[PDB]
């Protein structure tokens, strides 16, 4: 679900602004496959 992955992001990535923007988009994003894509992007985006 959207908010579940929002929480995942909040607990995963570092830059609060980039977090804000990825959140702004994921609430608009609606493709479950693209949700998995953004999820893997979040995980590998920990730098």
């Amino acid at each position: 679900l959207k908010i579940t992955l929002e929480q995942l992001a909040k607990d995963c990535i570092s830059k609060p602004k980039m977090r804000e923007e990825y959140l702004l988009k994921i609430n608009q994003a609606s493709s479950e496959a693209q949700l998995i894509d953004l999820k893997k992007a979040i995980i590998r985006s920990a730098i």
Binding site: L1, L5, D11, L35, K40
Partner: protein
């Protein structure tokens, strides 16, 4: 009122039928019924009357009796929670009693406050000093305040008062109106069935008040425990926000939230699905659970998206930034909201939906699974046997089956099976196999539920338009005639009869059907259930826990693929058509036809049900009601078996190492692979995940194939996320599932048998269970105190059966002092403190009594302001008790009230039940005068000189009355059968008088323990001024058991209490401790976050580590005591045998041979009657630990758990202390830290005793029903030892033959394994021997510690040139290389020689032994032609024949013995022969003789200003903990300094003086630092110039002795940390220092080095420093620290050390710089690179030289030319040749004295026996130079480990003085470090004097 007021905590479902039935019976504001009300009002209710008076009273007290729309008048039964939250009764004029509650508890807490704090603080000082650490204040006041300054409290007290009122009302109803209570803005209607709430009004039935009370008290206790700083505001905010939001949602919706409640528990796992390494699992499980709860909510019209998303966010908000433990706690409290109210419709409809869902039968999968089930069964039956597995079938397909069957292949591979179909079907109708029925009397003597026959609905309830039955299988079963499993199994193989009506309520059936059910369950789970694989479920606790924990551990490395599921439908999903193969297979396996499937079978043709909407219906009706589906819990044994089958089939489908647990329907599986174990761990988790993912998909496919709606909502997978029985395991730990126990902090006892005592006990155990995990201990102590206080308060004020009659109530309540004074004594010795302090650190007990008095003494010394109490209880009135009363229990103190009515009521229950009897020969099993027989046995056992409780206990447990006792004990004791037993109403009134007012008289007795009573003056001072708990317990037990037993005090028990004996102290960084034994170490290790491989240590976890003829054998073995062997005592044993033995033809043999000798120690333990035990344990940090006992506590002995028990208790204690030191949220913040248990200053060690006696009172019970050279030493020792790998006693009188023969046996076994695979004589033998030996370190560690130990054994072997010891201080390799030499020597034997006549431990195995021998013989002795393997029995025998007839033409050795190659000693058991023959060699025999100072130098460490550091090699041996062996005990060399002194050290002094004269030195001032009590230093001045020494000693709690005996007249002729070192430097040549401490990775005495620096400043005089490399790292660290501002340092080895690591003697800008230098140079620096080998060979030279010195001192020579040099400054009793006749006379007189005597306080004889032997030892010591050299070497060995085997053994024969005591042999055969050293030096003085 009459007996046993009803439940106080619900265990019955809460329904909607009953509440609606009540409220609609009344006239009060669409149910499943609208039938009639006036008729039933007439129908004998009185409920109508009660509720109509309720109604009209409310009418006269409501303004709105009948208005438009009910303005504020809402019948809100829709489970309001915020409304009970609403101030319903918060009229702040509180009920008067509860104010007294508060006053009493607060004042008692205040008065007891100040003492307990400093009490526990002093207890901390005793352990290490300021324990209970966390990185604020804790106290009793904080606890009590938080519990009374919190919310939810007043409401909980209100609801408790409510519950009490309702209990009073229902009691009235039992006796025989209702209660109407008015008050401001509220109405209190109290009926025995309903209560009203209104300031918005509602009703509540009975069970509802129980639910709400439990709920509120629970959340109260939860937030209370949360208030403490340990688990602070995070969890507080969590619970409060969650409670609030959930209550609001429950209001908004209703029952639906209850559903999501279940779906909410699984949600936290989703968060705990933060298995951050492996992805996709977050977005898998968190998403799944969130979406499913979204559905479960939006399905009931709250709102679609906005409300949904917002409520989901606000609901998950209590789940952030939390590590597992807190989240698991949060779950265990998330269940606190009570259950929903039940109704037949929903659940009946679901379990109906368990009807037809598709007859999807899959023959392939079921057939493959039946095949694998057959295979598992076969392999298991093979393993759990020597093995036959005899199937009478398989004519079908497999000639491979033909081979692997006809050979009786003990193994059957799974991969072998997967390539076949239809492996076997043992299907017949003929006979039985490996099973039998009609046993295990436990099952059908224990009862279960039972339904009614066809006419049921009437018996289920009334209101129709017909009789009740209300029986239970226990009643009729006991009152049954001619019953037996056989007739039952005949009914099983008989009818489709219309006499079974399956009911549901978790379901019941009829009498005969349920009997068949229990019989079948027993048969399967007993005979087949034993066959186990892929489950550690054998026992209850040890194997179960250890297996789960260890699968979690092997998941961890230094395998991350776990999964689990919990399923329910797995019961109600199965089908007959898909289980009958298993049915018929196991059927014919057990012979008895059609047994294992009939029950489910019948459920196909019948209807069932769980009130009922009728028209006119009483029979079979197509559908409330359900028609023939699966069943809940019947035969789930076979369910679990087939589960194992399908799991193993899945495992074989995709090969992977799988280990699982599966029971009921739930299971969990871990899987690991052969992953390369070097690359980073992340992709390791990735590979593990891929493997387990393929596995799980295949498992899902198959599981559905068998037909199983297995879905995602039942399963969860991760890396380290194990789950089972609501206990989750994570990252290799038991999660702190503590807070649930918190909510189980109830306010009263179990339901039955109300009594204060047991209540507190339960409470105690509960909070003690709390102690096990999470919360620290001090809060637990305080919380137990507060809980007992508040509980005793709640009991004294408004007692549950309140009557103000007695004045004990007022005399208790009027003072708060009394209740504290009564809640502060250990319950075992009276009081309500059930062992929360001592047990605070060990689940084992030892003795509680000594622990009770230890706790008491510790409290009073710390101060509870009651000292006289000890004298009062000592002088307390000795209770009555009885003989059998004490017999039934050891550890007992005769007091009046130590047994609550629960045990008494249950005992009378089972008794009056046995009274009902028409059964089989069980008749004699119940007798009238059994108690008379128990008291007769007690008289027979305890009316003697020396008395032991435990022996009488076990001996009555095992005898005939033992089985009667156990049988009549293991009945059913539930409330139902309790009332059904009280159907035997006339117990008594006297007994009733006893029961119904128990607590009154208990409180009266403790009132008799009021303000100080009379004090007996003699024994008061005789025992006051606390000395030891041991002696106080002794005297107390004696004096209190006097009234019956009188003079004799009982002994045989009472190992001491930990907190008294052990004190210890920790060390962190720099620290000193008490002057030195054992020590726990802890490296600086972090929790998770780095790499488990980078986590510094290796994780070594540690925890608390044919018929009843067996029982009669234990009986005899413990009874005779195995040493006192008369005709009388053995006749007694035979009579006890005729007593209990009722099984076979009674044992009439003369003298029991088979019973072994086991009286040596007290290893008596009991338990193991259950299947599992759920609340296992907790430990979270004792993994990185490193225990070590290399310091003295024990030598070679025959303890065998005598002092290993206190040893184990010390292990537990250290583990617990360290855990508590790091129990909360922690990190690496603690540096390398140790705990040293210097426990030499224990008040009492109390050495052991030993004697004999005979009891004689001749009473009998009565019942008869059904139920030359000794190379054999080496041989048998090799057997017993090498059999373990597959103790150095019995290995002391030996030589190299032991290793020779163990190597020989190992060669035999491995060579038989070699199966012709080429192994040449020397080369390949050596190779494969190494390859197989250098494995499995465990037993190798054992053998190492066992044989390679401090005594000459290692010296003997190395002098015999058996091994080669060349930092290099290793031991284990030597051990195995030892075996190497053996094998090597063994081969030389086989080079030429066929001697040694092999022995067998029947004829098949010894033929195979000959096979082994010939096989190896040829395997080397070939080299001319190969040979082939074939049949087992004789193929290799005829191979011997042929190959011998061949090689007889080509040989290397002599020819004649080859002929003798044509041509087996016997044995029966290893223990028998080994022990009896090692004690057989214990006569006069000298065959053991077969074995028959300026020499220490320098190492001159390093050159001036030298900086070339080399290869460190800091490698250390003893990586794992064997038994204590590095430097313990070699007291030989003490004879080398015979003086009149106590130090004797200065031999090292003259060595250092030699070194000094070996070089130049500056002027002499002689600095002596902090050491010396008449010690070495003198010599220096005696040999070097100085005037007025500069000397000090350590701060000593109390001046050199000998130095003032040396210097001062010859002159008169003409501890430090910061300040002491400063005074020292306040007061510049040579200085002398010496110390030692425990393990640490830094320095702590650099103070004295910098002292030397600054003092030579105030110019290069050289120092003297004692130090030793036990941890060579630390040595080098100190050496590196020295290599800074100093040059040409030298170190010199001594010869005062035993053969061991030496105690060697050594001669930038800021000190912190060098400190940090060496510390950071731990990384890459060591500075002792080459000379270590020279050191080592020198130490070996020294061992040889000191062995030579021992040889010399066996003669009259000396080590002179320096003895006189020291004597320059520096026991005469008569000696005779016939001191042998002297010994004869002395033993004669002393044994006459012993016969004469037998004809605070003291023992009897052990003291004088030890004193006699000691005096004889001293006589022999003085007369050493009178010497029969044989006896001289014998006593040399003895006094060297084998201590004092008496010399004049049989020559002491010379009648009356012998006839008076025939056990003189055992008297002849019955060593401590200090006295050992004393007598060594005494012998040295003897040799030097003459």
């Amino acid at each position: 009122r009459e007996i046993l007021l009803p439940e106080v905590h619900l265990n019955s479902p809460i329904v909607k039928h009953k509440l609606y039935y009540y409220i609609l019976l009344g006239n009060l504001p669409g149910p499943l019924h609208n039938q009639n009300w006036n008729q039933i009002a007439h129908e004998e209710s009185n409920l109508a009357q009660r509720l109509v008076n309720v109604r009209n009273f409310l009418i006269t007290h409501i303004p709105d009796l009948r208005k438009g729309h009910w303005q504020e008048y809402v019948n809100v039964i829709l489970w309001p929670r915020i409304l009970p939250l609403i101030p319903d009764f918060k009229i702040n004029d509180q009920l008067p009693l509860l104010k007294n509650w508060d006053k009493l508890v607060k004042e008692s807490c205040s008065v007891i406050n100040a003492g307990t704090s400093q009490c526990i603080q002093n207890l901390s000082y005793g352990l290490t000093g300021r324990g209970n650490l966390f990185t604020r204040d804790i106290d009793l006041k904080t606890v009590v305040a938080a519990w009374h300054d919190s919310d939810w409290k007043r409401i909980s007290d209100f609801w408790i008062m409510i519950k009490f009122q309702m209990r009073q009302l229902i009691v009235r109803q039992t006796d025989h109106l209702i209660t109407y209570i008015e008050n401001r803005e509220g109405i209190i209607i109290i009926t025995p069935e309903l209560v009203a709430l209104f300031n918005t009004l509602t009703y509540m039935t009975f069970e509802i008040v129980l639910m709400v009370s439990d709920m509120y008290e629970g959340r109260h206790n939860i937030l209370s425990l949360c208030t403490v700083s340990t688990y602070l505001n995070p969890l507080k905010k969590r619970i409060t926000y969650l409670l609030s939001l959930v209550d609001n949602l429950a209001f908004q919706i209703g029952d639906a939230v209850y559903n999501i409640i279940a779906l909410l528990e699984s949600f936290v796992y989703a968060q705990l699905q933060m298995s951050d390494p492996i992805p996709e699992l977050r977005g898998q499980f968190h998403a799944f659970v969130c979406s499913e709860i979204l559905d479960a909510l939006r399905g009931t019209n709250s709102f679609t998206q906005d409300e949904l998303r917002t409520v989901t966010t606000n609901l998950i908000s209590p789940f952030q930034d939390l590590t597992p433990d807190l989240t698991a706690e949060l779950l265990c409290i998330m269940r606190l909201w009570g259950h929903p109210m039940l109704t037949a419709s929903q659940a009946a409809g679901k379990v109906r939906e368990s009807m037809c869902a598709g007859k999807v039968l899959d023959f392939p999968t079921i057939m493959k699974t039946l095949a694998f089930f057959h295979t598992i069964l076969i392999n298991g039956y093979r393993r759990k046997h020597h093995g036959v597995w005899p199937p009478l079938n398989l004519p079908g397909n497999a000639s491979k089956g033909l081979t692997e069957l006809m050979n009786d292949n003990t193994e059957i591979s799974y991969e072998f099976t997967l390539k076949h179909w239809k492996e076997v079907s043992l299907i017949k109708f003929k006979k039985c196999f490996d099973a039998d029925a009609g046993e295990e009397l436990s099952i059908f003597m224990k009862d279960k539920a039972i339904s009614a026959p066809k006419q049921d609905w009437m018996s289920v309830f009334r209101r129709s338009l017909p009789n009740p039955f209300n029986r239970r299988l226990l009643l009729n079963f006991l009152g049954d005639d001619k019953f037996d499993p056989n007739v039952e199994l005949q009914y099983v193989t008989s009818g489709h009869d219309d006499t079974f009506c399956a009911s549901y309520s978790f379901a019941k059936l009829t009498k005969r059907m349920r009997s068949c059910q229990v019989i079948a369950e027993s048969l399967l789970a007993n005979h087949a259930g034993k066959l186990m694989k892929e489950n550690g479920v054998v026992m209850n606790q040890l194997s179960l826990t250890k297996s789960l924990l260890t699968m979690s551990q092997i998941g961890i490395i230094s395998a991350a693929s776990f999964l689990t599921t919990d399923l329910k439908k797995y019961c109600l999903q199965w089908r007959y058509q898909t289980i009958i193969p298993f049915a018929q297979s196991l059927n014919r396996m057990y012979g008895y036809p059609h047994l294992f499937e009939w029950i489910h079978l019948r459920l196909m043709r019948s209807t069932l049900y769980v009130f009922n909407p009728p028209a006119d219906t009483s029979q079979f009706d197509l559908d409330i009601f359900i028609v023939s589906p699966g069943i809940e819990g019947l035969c789930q044994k076979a369910w679990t078996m087939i589960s194992i089958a399908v799991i193993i089939l899945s495992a074989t489908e995709s090969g992977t190492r799988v280990m699982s647990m599966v029971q009921g329907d739930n299971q969990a599986i871990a899987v690991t692979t052969r992953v390369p174990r070097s690359l980073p761990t992340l992709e390791k988790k990735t590979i593990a995940f891929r493997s387990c993912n393929l596995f799980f998909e295949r498992l899902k496919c198959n599981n559905f194939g068998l037909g199983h709606h297995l879905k995602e909502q039942e399963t969860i997978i991760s890396s380290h996320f194990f789950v089972y029985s609501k206990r989750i395991f994570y990252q290799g730990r038991i999660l702190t599932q503590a807070l649930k126990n918190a909510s189980k902090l109830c306010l009263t006892a179990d339901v039955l048998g109300e009594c204060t005592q047991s209540s507190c006990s339960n409470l105690a155990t509960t909070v003690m269970r709390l102690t096990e995990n999470g919360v620290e201990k001090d809060i637990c102590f305080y919380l137990n105190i507060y809980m007992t206080i508040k509980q005793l308060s709640y009991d004294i004020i408004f007692p549950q059966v309140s009557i103000p009659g007695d004045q004990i109530t007022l005399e208790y309540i009027n003072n708060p002092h009394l209740v504290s004074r009564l809640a502060l004594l250990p319950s075992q010795l009276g009081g309500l403190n059930y062992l929360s302090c001592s047990r605070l650190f060990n689940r084992n007990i030892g003795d509680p009594v000594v622990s009770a008095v230890a706790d008491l003494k510790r409290l009073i010394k710390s101060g509870c302001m009651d000292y006289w109490i000890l004298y009062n209880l000592l002088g307390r009135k000795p209770g009555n008790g009885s003989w059998a009363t004490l017999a039934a229990d050891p550890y007992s103190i005769n007091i009046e009230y130590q047994y609550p009515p629960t045990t008494a009521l249950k005992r009378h229950t089972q008794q009056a039940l046995m009274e009902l009897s028409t059964n089989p020969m069980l008749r004699g099993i119940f007798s009238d005068n059994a108690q008379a027989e128990e008291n007769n046995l007690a008289r027979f056992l305890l009316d003697r000189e020396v008395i032991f409780p435990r022996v009488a206990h076990i001996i009555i447990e095992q005898t005939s009355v033992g089985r009667r006792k156990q049988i009549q004990g293991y009945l059913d004791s539930t409330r139902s059968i309790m009332r059904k037993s009280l159907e035997i109403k006339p117990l008594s009134n006297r007994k009733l008088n006893e029961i119904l007012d128990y607590n009154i008289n208990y409180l009266a007795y403790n009132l008799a323990l009021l303000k100080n009573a009379i004090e007996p003056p003699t024994y008061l001072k005789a025992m006051t001024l606390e000395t030891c708990s041991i002696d106080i317990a002794r005297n107390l037990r004696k004096l209190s058991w006097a009234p019956l037993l009188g003079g004799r005090n009982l002994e045989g028990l009472e190992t001491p209490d930990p907190i008294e004996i052990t004190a210890g102290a920790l060390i962190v960084g720099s620290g000193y401790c008490e002057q030195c034994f054992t020590w726990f170490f802890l490296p600086s290790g972090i929790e998770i976050g780095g790499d488990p491989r980078d986590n510094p240590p290796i994780r070594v976890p540690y925890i608390g580590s044919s018929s009843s003829l067996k029982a009669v054998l234990r009986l005899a073995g413990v009874y005779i005591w195995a040493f006192g062997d008369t005709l009388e005592n053995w006749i007694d044993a035979l009579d006890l045998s005729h007593t209990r033995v009722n099984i076979t033809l009674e044992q009439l043999q003369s003298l029991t041979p088979l019973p072994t000798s086991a009286n040596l120690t007290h290893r008596l333990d009991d338990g193991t009657t259950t299947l599992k035990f759920t609340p296992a344990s907790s430990y979270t940090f004792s993994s990185f630990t490193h225990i070590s006992n290399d310091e003295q506590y024990l030598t070679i002995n025959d303890k065998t758990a005598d002092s290993n028990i206190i040893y184990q208790q010390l292990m537990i204690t250290g583990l617990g202390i360290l855990e508590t030191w790091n129990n909360p949220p922690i990190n690496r913040t603690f540096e390398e830290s140790t705990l040293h248990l210097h426990t030499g200053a224990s008040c009492c060690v109390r050495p052991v005793d030993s004697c004999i006696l005979s009891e004689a009172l001749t009473v009998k019970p009565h019942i008869t029903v059904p139920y030359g050279k000794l190379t054999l030493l080496s041989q048998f020792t090799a057997r017993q030892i090498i059999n373990a790998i597959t103790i150095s006693e019995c290995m002391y009188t030996k030589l190299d033959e032991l290793f020779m023969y163990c190597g020989w046996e190992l060669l035999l076994e491995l060579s038989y394994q070699m199966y012709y695979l080429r192994v040449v004589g020397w080369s390949n033998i050596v190779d494969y021997s190494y390859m197989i030996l250098r494995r499995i370190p465990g037993a190798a560690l054992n053998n190492l510690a066992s044989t390679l130990s401090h005594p000459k054994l290692f010296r003997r072997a190395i002098n015999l040139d058996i091994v080669a010891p060349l930092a290099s201080l290793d031991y284990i390799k030597m051990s195995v290389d030892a075996i190497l030499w053996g094998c090597k020597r063994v081969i030389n034997v086989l080079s030429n020689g066929g001697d040694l006549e092999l022995v067998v431990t029947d004829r098949s195995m010894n033929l195979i032994a000959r096979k082994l021998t010939l096989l190896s013989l040829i395997h080397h002795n070939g080299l001319e032609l190969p040979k082939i393997k074939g049949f087992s029995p004789d193929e290799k025998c005829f191979a011997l024949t042929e190959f011998l007839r061949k090689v007889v033409n080509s040989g290397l050795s002599s020819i004649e013995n080859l002929s003798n190659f044509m041509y087996a000693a016997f044995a029966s058991n290893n223990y028998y022969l080994t022990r009896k023959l090692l004690n057989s060699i214990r006569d006069t025999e000298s065959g053991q003789v077969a074995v028959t100072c300026t020499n220490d130098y320098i190492i001159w460490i390093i050159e001036s200003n030298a900086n070339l550091e080399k290869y460190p090699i800091p490698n250390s041996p003893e990586d794992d903990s064997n038994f204590h062996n590095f430097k313990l005990n070699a007291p030989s060399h003490h004879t080398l300094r015979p003086l009149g002194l106590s130090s004797t050290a200065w031999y090292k002094g003259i060595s250092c003086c030699r070194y000094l004269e070996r070089l130049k030195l500056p002027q002499g001032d002689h600095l002596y630092i902090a050491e010396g009590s008449g010690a070495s230093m003198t010599i220096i001045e005696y040999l070097f110039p100085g005037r007025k020494i500069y000397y000090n000693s350590l701060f000593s709690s109390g001046m050199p002795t000998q130095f003032i005996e040396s210097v001062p007249y010859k002159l008169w002729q003409a501890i430090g940390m910061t300040a002491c070192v400063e005074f020292i430097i306040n007061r510049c040549s040579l200085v002398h220092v010496d110390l030692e401490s425990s393990a640490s990775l830094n320095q702590q005495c650099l103070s004295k080095p910098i002292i030397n620096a600054i003092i030579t400043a105030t110019p290069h005089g050289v120092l003297i420093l004692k130090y030793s490399w036990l941890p060579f790292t630390r040595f080098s660290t100190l050496i590196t620290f020295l290599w800074c501002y100093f040059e040409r340092i030298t170190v010199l080895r001594s010869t005062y050390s035993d053969p061991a690591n030496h105690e060697v003697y050594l001669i930038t800008v800021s000190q912190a710089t060098g400190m940090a230098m060496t510390l950071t140079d731990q990384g890459f620096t060591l500075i002792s690179p080459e000379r270590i080998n020279q050191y080592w060979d020198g130490h070996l030279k020294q061992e040889r030289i000191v062995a030579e010195a021992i040889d010399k001192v066996v003669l009259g020579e000396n080590a002179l030319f320096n003895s006189s040099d020291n004597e320059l400054i520096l026991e005469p009793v008569a000696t005779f040749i016939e001191f042998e006749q002297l010994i004869c006379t002395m033993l004669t007189t002393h044994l006459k004295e012993i016969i004469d005597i037998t004809r605070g306080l003291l023992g009897k004889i052990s003291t004088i026996v030890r004193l006699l032997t000691e005096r004889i030892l001293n006589h022999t010591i003085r007369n050493w130079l009178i010497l029969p050299p044989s006896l001289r070497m014998i006593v040399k060995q003895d006094l060297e480990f084998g201590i004092f085997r008496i010399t004049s053994i049989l020559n002491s024969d010379r009648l009356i003085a012998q006839l008076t005591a025939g056990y003189i042999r055992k008297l002849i055969e019955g060593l401590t470090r200090p006295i050992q050293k004393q007598i060594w030096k005494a012998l040295g003085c003897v040799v030097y004097c003459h």
